[PDB]
Amino acid sequence: SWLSKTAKKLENSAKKRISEGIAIAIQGGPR
């Protein structure tokens, strides 16, 4: 995973970890 050292209420790198799963989830989802 890595990254996301701080996201208690800022989310600086938490959007990168999701961009991996959300990228494939939508790539083959209902869109």
From Swiss-Prot:
Expressed in the body wall, intestine, uterus and ovary. It is found in: Secreted. Keywords: Antibiotic, Antimicrobial, Secreted, Signal. GO terms for biological process: antibacterial humoral response; antimicrobial peptide secretion; defense response to bacterium. GO terms for cellular component: extracellular region. Induction: By bacterial infection. Belongs to the cecropin family. Has antibacterial activity against several Gram-positive and Gram-negative bacteria. Is weakly active against yeasts. Acts by a nonpore mechanism. This is Cecropin-P1.
